[PDB]
Amino acid sequence: LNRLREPLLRRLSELLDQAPEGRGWRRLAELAGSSCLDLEQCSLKVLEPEGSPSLCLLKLMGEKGCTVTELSDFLQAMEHTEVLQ
Amino acid sequence: EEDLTEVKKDALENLRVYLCEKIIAERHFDHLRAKKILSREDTEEISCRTSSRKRAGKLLDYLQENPKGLDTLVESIRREKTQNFLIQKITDEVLKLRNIKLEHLK
């Protein structure tokens, strides 16, 4: 999450931004179990020409202290295996 | 960049019908009048209208001359925190039209 380098996070964010899926980034922010300011500041971070909501959400979950295998478990729960590959 | 400008323009003007109902017309043009994008002549032209809705119409259509106006339209709504649920709606609209532009790039 917050520990890793620039290209992995950048590519994962710029791939998660282009989400034609109905289970998009707002779905990925809404996980199972574990207020408004997170969603509002990500949705205002998208207004810049070079931003993603995905970057804001990955920074948020890195501030959560999530780990890469933990997030991969959440992504398997997200049940789009195209993201995991 | 002007690509953001054009997608911002059509991303506003595609959705004129919904926004011209749930917006009080008078309660904003002191904030955006401080941004030096709107004048007293606009205030008199808006007050020339008699209907509720057409005020919102000509006011909403009187912002398509500068790209940065929509932010100010957010900002007063950000300022007076009475209603705020329109934000992620128009935001998701911008993400959608941005996605079509992005797929049209390659």
Numbering used by the authors:
A (entry chain F): 30 to 63, 70 to 120
B (entry chain H): 10 to 115
Authors' account:
CARD11, B cell lymphoma 10 (BCL10) and mucosa-associated lymphoid tissue lymphoma translocation protein 1 (MALT1) assemble the CARD11-BCL10-MALT1 (CBM) complex that bridges TCR/BCR proximal signaling to the canonical IκB kinase (IKK)/NF-κB and JNK pathway in lymphocytes. Upon assembly, the CBM complex serves as a scaffolding platform that activates downstream signaling events via association of mediators such as ubiquitin ligases (e.g., TRAF6) and protein kinases (e.g., TAK1 and IKKβ). Beyond the scaffolding function, MALT1 is a paracaspase and contributes proteolytic activity to the CBM complex, which is key for optimal lymphocyte activation and differentiation. CARD11 acts as a molecular seed that upon binding induces the assembly of BCL10 filaments in vitro and in cells.
To provide structural information about the interaction of BCL10 with MALT1 we performed cryo-electron microscopy (cryo-EM) of the human BCL10 (full length)-MALT1 (T29-G722) complex. Visual inspection of cryo-EM images of the purified complex, underpinned by 2D classification and examination of the power spectra, revealed that BCL10-MALT1 assembles into flexible helical filaments of ~29 nm in diameter, with an ordered inner core of ~14 nm in diameter and a less defined periphery. Our analysis revealed that BCL10-MALT1 is a left-handed helix with a per subunit rotation of 100.8° and a rise of 5.083 Å, resulting in 3.571 subunits of BCL10-MALT1 per helical turn. This helical arrangement agrees with the one observed for the BCL10 (residue 1–115) filament alone, thus indicating that the overall arrangement of the BCL10 CARD core is largely unaltered within the BCL10-MALT1 complex structure. The 4.9 Å resolution map of the inner filament part enabled us to build a pseudo atomic model of BCL10 residues 10–115 and MALT1 residues (30–121) by flexible fitting of a BCL10 homology model and a related crystal structure of MALT1 DD into the EM density. Whereas type I and type II interactions are interstrand contacts between the helical turns, the type III interface exhibits interactions in the helical-strand direction. The MALT1 DD interacts with BCL10 at the rim of the CARD core filament in a 1:1 stoichiometry. A close-up view of the BCL10-MALT1 interaction site I (BM-I) illustrates that MALT1 binds to the C-terminal part (BCL10 helix α6) of the BCL10 CARD forming a new interface that is distinct from the BCL10 filament interfaces I–III. In BM-I, the two most central interacting residues of MALT1 are V81 and L82 situated in helix α4.
